[PDB]
Design a protein around this ligand. Structure first.
Ligand SMILES: CCCCCCCC/C=C/CCCCCCCC(=O)OC[C@H](O)CO
Ligand SMILES: CCCCCCCC/C=C/CCCCCCCC(=O)OC[C@H](O)CO
Ligand SMILES: CCCCCCCC/C=C\CCCCCCCC(=O)OC[C@H](O)CO
Ligand SMILES: CCCCCCCC/C=C\CCCCCCCC(=O)OC[C@H](O)CO
Ligand SMILES: CCCCCCCC/C=C\CCCCCCCC(=O)OC[C@H](O)CO
Ligand SMILES: CCCCCCCC/C=C\CCCCCCCC(=O)OC[C@H](O)CO
Ligand SMILES: CCCCCCCC/C=C\CCCCCCCC(=O)OC[C@H](O)CO
Ligand SMILES: CCCCCCCC/C=C\CCCCCCCC(=O)OC[C@H](O)CO
Ligand SMILES: CCCCCCCC/C=C\CCCCCCCC(=O)OC[C@H](O)CO
Ligand SMILES: CCCCCCCC/C=C\CCCCCCCC(=O)OC[C@H](O)CO
Ligand SMILES: *C/C=C(C)/C=C/C=C(C)/C=C/C1=C(C)CCCC1(C)C
Ligand SMILES: *C/C=C(C)/C=C/C=C(C)/C=C/C1=C(C)CCCC1(C)C
Lengths: 294, 294
């Protein structure tokens, strides 16, 4: 540690004395991060993630910028974890006694908006983004900022900022859901609709797990230890980023093959909220005005 | 303060003893935030900003969501400053001795992307955003994340993260410049082109001042004190947000009046990098294919 770890209790445990060496001191910081079993598990999941993220980068290496940016950051993340995981400021040890994993929240700020940009162009064919895309990004940034602030805070201050994060988060989840519904009815009828369905399940489950891990972790009720929280977070990271990004590359190849073999043939379908989506079709026998009541 | 402020030096200044009351302690945290003159100046500029931001909200209150979101956050910001400016986590007092103004960086994360979204639709007429818009947002988020990490860090770690912020920042500034060039040649020939020119000056000067205030502040070489840094930051905040947002509302009204009186009549002008922009014109005697060599 690069904070003070050696001290003496004096006067029946009522006074703590430390070397006057300029280092900060706090008992709360010295609480254990967890068991050796938790530590072993965390280093394994990290290695798996560093390696798999590096494989994904090379694999994608065989437009497309979103999968690479996230996979690059994940890799960079491990080297910092690997060398300085518990060094400030990968973990912030603050005057109120909290341990805040800035690396995680910073990583979310780097990667989550890019995932949402990817989500807004699942097929990869669009060159533009609507107004709703922008709201998705702004709501998600706020979620992380409130969540980070909550983690840095204590008591009632933590609770309030968490709840604003929850309000921002619901708005994010709701609009993400809207995007996936449009995407499902946009992509061709076969395999493309299977992949999109898989991504929705992956997305809502993995992203939905995050507020739960927060509540359980040191940032909340301290059920999970620091290592415990790391293991959980790396799991849902693999889901939310690596696996989801894999599917996204796969989905985009499938969309590309469809347009190469069949061309870009569109049919307008309307979904009655009442939304309209231009579905990709396979042959020119369809170019009509189809609908679908929900 | 809610950290330890009372201590005794023992053994010829080599041992510090504190009450064992659970509070964290560090000498670095107790350095003064600055002179009383600096404090007075900071409270004045904050009040000016709280009031003026509230005026802007009501004033805009007489599409348009970007001016309100930023002005709302600025207002909320002051109430937190007003009650808990130097309470954790508005300022983070970390184990490495740094004081990091999380409120500022968090505020930047909330407001700067929205300013850039505004910038990407200065006229307010567009319903879509290109790929380049998305890069603008992603580069800017990275800047803040690296800058925040640099502020939280020390020594060579601070320097590296600052430089990545600088690389991200240049990419942001460059693309912002691209947007303003397109915007200038898009808006009508008269007053609209004056306002856009004003915004470019405001934008690059106020945003450009931020890395400079960083280098001078406690986050860098400690030339400026904490209060000193606050005063500077509130000034360029008024420029980057309040004044710029004012012009943006004004610019959008002017664009709206043009389309109401004259309708939406466009002419394609091409700018030889070679870029094409559809300029708004006043009468149907222009609908041609004009160009302009740079
Ligand atoms: C994400 C979109 C779908 C929403 C589903 C969300 C997942 C579960 C959240 C649940 C209830 C909120 C719980 C609020 C309590 C949190 C307060 C806290 O963290 O505890 C602080 C306290 O000071 C320490 O003792
Ligand atoms: C923003 C786009 C246009 C670019 C214009 C930028 C404005 C000026 C930046 C300049 C040089 C960079 C200076 C790099 C030195 C910073 C390192 C530092 O902060 O000092 C840490 C040290 O450890 C404490 O003693
Ligand atoms: C680690 C195994 C995961 C926890 C198993 C329960 C246990 O006690 O295992 C401890 C053993 O000494 C180690 O494998
Ligand atoms: C394989 C090594 C992985 C190093 C990280 C990225 C490669 C991204 C290319 C841009 C270079 C950035 C490297 C960096 O450290 O920033
Ligand atoms: C997002 C980037 C995050 C964490 C910043 C990287 C972690 C910085 C820690 C570097 C450090 O100070 O390590 C000193 C070493 O422990 C001497 O023994
Ligand atoms: C807490 C919920 C607040 C949700 C904050 C998310 C705001 C998203 C947004 O700004 O959307 C603007 C919309 O287009 C307006 O016309
Ligand atoms: C405050 C005035 C800004 C600094 C003026 C220089 C000065 O010394 O003024 C101190 C005086 O006591 C107070 O006005
Ligand atoms: C005038 C009071 C200003 C209070 C802040 C915002 C109004 C924004 C309307 C949404 C309500 C959010 C209020 C909040 O505190 O979050
Ligand atoms: C972005 C939001 C930021 C700062 C969070 C708000 C600042 C939280 C400080 C509240 C607090 O703990 O105040 C205790 C008071 O000082 C008892 O005397
Ligand atoms: C450090 C400079 C790195 C700049 C990081 C900014 C990346 C912006 C971006 O992702 O743009 C993607 C582009 O569209 C690709 O096709
Ligand atoms: C790669 C990392 C990802 C996809 C992280 C996602 C994180 C979230 C969806 C976090 C959500 C939260 C809330 C819904 C409420 C406030 C607490 C948070 C930040 C954990
Ligand atoms: C309302 C707040 C605004 C507009 C803040 C803008 C901040 C910046 C443009 C900061 C830029 C930085 C760099 C260019 C390099 C790294 C250090 C920063 C974060 C100060």
């Amino acid at each position: 540690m690069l904070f003070q770890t050696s001290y003496t209790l004096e006067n029946n445990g009522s006074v703590i004395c430390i070397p006057n060496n300029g280092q900060c001191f706090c008992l709360a910081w010295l609480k254990s991060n967890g068991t050796n079993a938790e530590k072993l598990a965390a280093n394994i999941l990290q290695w798996i993630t560093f390696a798999l993220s590096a494989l994904c980068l090379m694999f994608y290496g065989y437009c497309g910028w979103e999968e690479i940016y996230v996979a690059t950051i994940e890799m960079i993340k491990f080297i910092i974890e690997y060398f300085h995981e518990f060094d400030e400021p990968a973990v912030i040890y603050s005057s109120n006694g909290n341990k805040t994993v800035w690396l995680r929240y910073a990583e979310w700020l780097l990667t989550c908006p890019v995932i949402l940009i990817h989500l807004s162009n699942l097929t990869g064919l669009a060159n533009d983004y609507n107004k709703r895309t922008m709201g998705l990004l702004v709501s998600d940034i706020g979620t992380i900022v409130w969540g980070t602030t909550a983690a840095l805070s204590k008591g009632y201050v933590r609770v309030i900022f968490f709840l604003m994060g929850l309000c921002y988060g619901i708005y994010t989840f709701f609009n993400a859901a809207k995007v996936y519904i449009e995407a499902y009815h946009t992509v061709p009828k076969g395999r493309c609709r299977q992949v999109v369905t898989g991504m929705a399940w992956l997305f809502f489950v993995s992203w939905g797990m995050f507020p739960i891990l927060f509540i359980l972790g040191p940032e909340g009720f301290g059920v999970l230890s620091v290592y415990g929280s790391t293991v959980g977070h790396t799991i849902i990271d693999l889901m939310s980023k690596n696996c989801w990004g894999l599917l996204g590359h796969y989905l985009r190849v499938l969309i590309h093959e469809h347009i190469l073999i069949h061309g870009d043939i569109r049919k307008t379908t309307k979904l009655n909220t009442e939304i309209e989506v231009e579905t990709l079709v396979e042959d020119e026998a369809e170019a009509g005005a189809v609908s679908s009541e929900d």
